[PDB]
């Protein structure tokens, strides 16, 4: 009751930037850590287990993800933001692209 | 890219009340609907698909869950609240219990 947590991750191409979106609902914000070691982003954090469970589908406890950049990014450019249970981490690309609108 | 969404659900025994916790990060709050038809709670809502995806693990779009109460509840007592990507729906039990602290 209360399973191991692997929060689901997206990489979005935002032209000049590369976005990582990570589904982290109910996280203790103060436990979130983000580290970039060359071509990998490491994300860790925690959410408390729910007390007095009658039925459980939801994951609990600490999570750790090691996620490779789909595209090379500039070093030390990462900026992270959390809203509505979603962590958005934005990095600037080494080779920015620009959407051609039609 | 962007899978069908089934948000994970817990039932917590809160003594006098029965709590449903539903992991809904990134939901459009204005699309959430909650209906109780006797011994079933129906929850529906939506979140937008992420644009320009390079890699995708995260679910998108509309979700619908039909969830049976683990314990009988008083009719029309449901109250729903959303914070940090988590929907907490609270119902008062027909037969309240009380935790005996030691």
CSV table of C-alpha atoms in Angstrom, one decimal:
chain,number,residue,atom,x,y,z
A,1,UNK,CA,0.0,0.0,0.0
A,2,UNK,CA,1.7,3.2,-1.4
A,3,UNK,CA,4.0,2.2,-4.3
A,4,UNK,CA,7.6,3.2,-5.3
A,5,UNK,CA,7.4,6.6,-7.1
A,6,UNK,CA,8.7,7.2,-10.7
A,7,UNK,CA,7.2,10.6,-11.8
A,8,UNK,CA,6.4,10.7,-15.5
A,9,UNK,CA,8.7,13.0,-17.6
A,10,UNK,CA,8.3,14.9,-20.9
A,11,UNK,CA,10.9,16.8,-23.0
A,12,UNK,CA,9.4,19.7,-24.9
A,13,UNK,CA,11.2,21.5,-27.7
A,14,UNK,CA,10.7,25.2,-27.0
A,15,UNK,CA,12.9,26.5,-29.8
A,16,UNK,CA,15.7,28.3,-28.0
A,17,UNK,CA,15.1,26.3,-24.9
A,18,UNK,CA,14.6,22.6,-23.9
A,19,UNK,CA,11.9,22.0,-21.3
A,20,UNK,CA,11.6,19.1,-18.9
A,21,UNK,CA,8.1,18.7,-17.5
A,22,UNK,CA,7.9,16.3,-14.5
A,23,UNK,CA,4.6,15.2,-12.9
A,24,UNK,CA,5.2,15.7,-9.2
A,25,UNK,CA,1.8,16.2,-7.5
A,26,UNK,CA,1.8,16.5,-3.6
A,27,UNK,CA,5.6,16.8,-3.4
A,28,UNK,CA,7.2,18.4,-0.4
A,29,UNK,CA,8.7,21.3,-2.4
A,30,UNK,CA,11.6,21.6,0.1
A,31,UNK,CA,13.0,18.1,-0.8
A,32,UNK,CA,13.3,18.8,-4.6
A,33,UNK,CA,16.8,18.8,-5.9
A,34,UNK,CA,18.1,19.2,-9.5
A,35,UNK,CA,21.7,18.6,-10.7
A,36,UNK,CA,23.1,18.6,-14.2
A,37,UNK,CA,26.3,16.5,-14.8
A,38,UNK,CA,27.1,17.1,-18.4
A,39,UNK,CA,24.5,15.3,-20.5
A,40,UNK,CA,22.2,14.0,-17.7
A,41,UNK,CA,19.7,15.8,-15.5
A,42,UNK,CA,19.2,14.2,-12.1
A,43,UNK,CA,16.0,15.0,-10.3
A,44,UNK,CA,15.1,13.9,-6.8
A,45,UNK,CA,12.4,14.7,-4.2
A,46,UNK,CA,9.8,13.2,-1.9
A,47,UNK,CA,6.2,13.0,-1.0
A,48,UNK,CA,4.7,11.7,2.3
A,49,UNK,CA,2.8,8.4,2.4
A,50,UNK,CA,-1.0,8.8,2.9
A,51,UNK,CA,-2.1,7.8,6.4
A,52,UNK,CA,-4.9,5.2,7.1
A,53,UNK,CA,-5.2,3.9,3.6
A,54,UNK,CA,-8.3,1.8,2.6
A,55,UNK,CA,-7.3,1.5,-1.0
A,56,UNK,CA,-4.1,2.6,-2.7
A,57,UNK,CA,-3.0,3.3,-6.3
A,58,UNK,CA,-0.9,6.4,-5.7
A,59,UNK,CA,2.9,6.2,-5.3
A,60,UNK,CA,4.6,7.5,-2.1
A,61,UNK,CA,8.0,8.3,-0.7
A,62,UNK,CA,11.3,9.4,-2.4
A,63,UNK,CA,11.9,9.4,-6.1
A,64,UNK,CA,15.1,9.6,-8.1
A,65,UNK,CA,15.4,10.1,-11.9
A,66,UNK,CA,18.5,10.2,-14.1
A,67,UNK,CA,17.4,11.7,-17.4
A,68,UNK,CA,19.5,12.3,-20.5
A,69,UNK,CA,19.1,15.5,-22.5
A,70,UNK,CA,17.5,14.8,-25.9
A,71,UNK,CA,19.5,17.8,-27.2
A,72,UNK,CA,22.8,19.3,-26.0
A,73,UNK,CA,22.2,22.3,-23.7
A,74,UNK,CA,24.4,25.2,-22.5
A,75,UNK,CA,26.1,24.5,-19.1
A,76,UNK,CA,24.5,26.0,-16.0
A,77,UNK,CA,21.5,27.4,-17.8
A,78,UNK,CA,18.8,25.3,-15.9
A,79,UNK,CA,15.9,27.1,-14.2
A,80,UNK,CA,13.2,25.2,-12.4
A,81,UNK,CA,9.6,26.1,-11.5
A,82,UNK,CA,6.8,24.3,-9.8
A,83,UNK,CA,3.0,24.9,-10.3
A,84,UNK,CA,-0.1,22.7,-10.1
A,85,UNK,CA,1.9,19.5,-9.3
A,86,UNK,CA,4.1,20.0,-12.4
A,87,UNK,CA,7.8,20.7,-12.3
A,88,UNK,CA,9.0,22.7,-15.4
A,89,UNK,CA,12.8,22.8,-15.8
A,90,UNK,CA,14.0,25.0,-18.7
A,91,UNK,CA,17.5,24.8,-20.3
A,92,UNK,CA,18.9,26.8,-23.2
A,93,UNK,CA,20.0,24.8,-26.2
A,94,UNK,CA,23.5,24.8,-27.6
A,95,UNK,CA,22.0,24.9,-31.1
A,96,UNK,CA,18.7,26.9,-30.8
A,97,UNK,CA,16.0,26.3,-33.4
A,98,UNK,CA,13.2,28.7,-34.3
A,99,UNK,CA,9.6,27.7,-35.3
A,100,UNK,CA,8.7,28.9,-38.8
A,101,UNK,CA,5.1,30.1,-38.5
A,102,UNK,CA,2.8,29.9,-41.6
B,1,UNK,CA,3.2,10.5,-27.8
B,2,UNK,CA,1.0,11.7,-24.9
B,3,UNK,CA,-0.9,8.6,-23.4
B,4,UNK,CA,-4.4,8.1,-22.2
B,5,UNK,CA,-4.9,9.4,-18.7
B,6,UNK,CA,-6.0,7.4,-15.7
B,7,UNK,CA,-5.1,9.5,-12.6
B,8,UNK,CA,-4.0,7.4,-9.6
B,9,UNK,CA,-6.6,7.3,-6.6
B,10,UNK,CA,-6.3,6.7,-2.9
B,11,UNK,CA,-9.1,6.2,-0.3
B,12,UNK,CA,-8.1,7.5,3.2
B,13,UNK,CA,-10.0,6.6,6.3
B,14,UNK,CA,-10.3,10.0,8.1
B,15,UNK,CA,-12.5,8.7,11.0
B,16,UNK,CA,-15.7,10.6,10.6
B,17,UNK,CA,-14.9,11.2,7.0
B,18,UNK,CA,-13.8,9.3,3.9
B,19,UNK,CA,-11.2,11.0,1.7
B,20,UNK,CA,-10.5,10.4,-2.0
B,21,UNK,CA,-7.1,11.7,-3.1
B,22,UNK,CA,-6.7,11.9,-6.9
B,23,UNK,CA,-3.3,12.7,-8.5
B,24,UNK,CA,-4.3,15.3,-11.2
B,25,UNK,CA,-1.2,17.5,-11.9
B,26,UNK,CA,-1.5,20.1,-14.6
B,27,UNK,CA,-5.4,19.7,-14.9
B,28,UNK,CA,-7.5,22.6,-16.3
B,29,UNK,CA,-9.3,23.2,-13.0
B,30,UNK,CA,-12.4,24.4,-14.9
B,31,UNK,CA,-13.0,21.0,-16.5
B,32,UNK,CA,-13.1,19.0,-13.3
B,33,UNK,CA,-16.5,17.4,-12.6
B,34,UNK,CA,-17.6,15.3,-9.6
B,35,UNK,CA,-20.9,13.3,-9.3
B,36,UNK,CA,-22.1,10.8,-6.8
B,37,UNK,CA,-24.7,8.3,-7.9
B,38,UNK,CA,-25.4,6.2,-4.7
B,39,UNK,CA,-22.3,4.1,-4.1
B,40,UNK,CA,-20.1,5.4,-6.9
B,41,UNK,CA,-18.1,8.5,-7.3
B,42,UNK,CA,-17.5,9.7,-10.9
B,43,UNK,CA,-14.6,12.0,-11.5
B,44,UNK,CA,-13.8,13.6,-14.9
B,45,UNK,CA,-11.6,16.3,-16.2
B,46,UNK,CA,-8.9,17.2,-18.7
B,47,UNK,CA,-5.3,18.4,-19.2
B,48,UNK,CA,-3.9,19.8,-22.4
B,49,UNK,CA,-1.4,17.8,-24.5
B,50,UNK,CA,2.2,19.2,-24.3
B,51,UNK,CA,3.3,20.8,-27.6
B,52,UNK,CA,6.4,19.9,-29.6
B,53,UNK,CA,7.3,16.7,-27.7
B,54,UNK,CA,10.7,15.2,-28.1
B,55,UNK,CA,10.1,12.4,-25.6
B,56,UNK,CA,6.9,11.6,-23.8
B,57,UNK,CA,6.0,9.5,-20.7
B,58,UNK,CA,3.2,11.8,-19.3
B,59,UNK,CA,-0.5,11.2,-20.0
B,60,UNK,CA,-2.7,13.9,-21.7
B,61,UNK,CA,-6.3,14.7,-22.5
B,62,UNK,CA,-9.5,13.8,-20.8
B,63,UNK,CA,-9.8,11.3,-18.0
B,64,UNK,CA,-12.9,9.6,-16.6
B,65,UNK,CA,-13.0,7.4,-13.4
B,66,UNK,CA,-15.9,5.5,-11.8
B,67,UNK,CA,-14.8,4.8,-8.2
B,68,UNK,CA,-16.9,2.7,-5.7
B,69,UNK,CA,-17.0,4.0,-2.1
B,70,UNK,CA,-15.0,1.6,0.2
B,71,UNK,CA,-17.4,2.6,3.0
B,72,UNK,CA,-21.0,3.9,2.8
B,73,UNK,CA,-21.3,7.7,3.0
B,74,UNK,CA,-24.0,10.2,3.8
B,75,UNK,CA,-25.8,11.4,0.6
B,76,UNK,CA,-24.7,14.9,-0.8
B,77,UNK,CA,-21.9,15.4,1.7
B,78,UNK,CA,-19.1,15.5,-0.8
B,79,UNK,CA,-16.7,18.5,-0.8
B,80,UNK,CA,-13.7,18.8,-3.2
B,81,UNK,CA,-10.5,20.8,-3.0
B,82,UNK,CA,-7.5,21.0,-5.3
B,83,UNK,CA,-3.9,21.9,-4.3
B,84,UNK,CA,-0.5,21.0,-5.6
B,85,UNK,CA,-1.8,18.7,-8.4
B,86,UNK,CA,-3.9,16.7,-5.9
B,87,UNK,CA,-7.7,16.6,-5.7
B,88,UNK,CA,-9.0,15.9,-2.2
B,89,UNK,CA,-12.6,14.9,-2.1
B,90,UNK,CA,-14.1,14.5,1.4
B,91,UNK,CA,-17.3,12.6,2.3
B,92,UNK,CA,-18.8,12.0,5.7
B,93,UNK,CA,-19.3,8.4,6.6
B,94,UNK,CA,-22.6,6.8,7.5
B,95,UNK,CA,-20.9,4.9,10.4
B,96,UNK,CA,-18.2,7.3,11.6
B,97,UNK,CA,-15.2,5.7,13.4
B,98,UNK,CA,-12.9,7.5,15.9
B,99,UNK,CA,-9.1,6.7,16.2
B,100,UNK,CA,-8.2,5.6,19.7
B,101,UNK,CA,-4.9,7.4,20.5
B,102,UNK,CA,-2.4,5.7,22.9
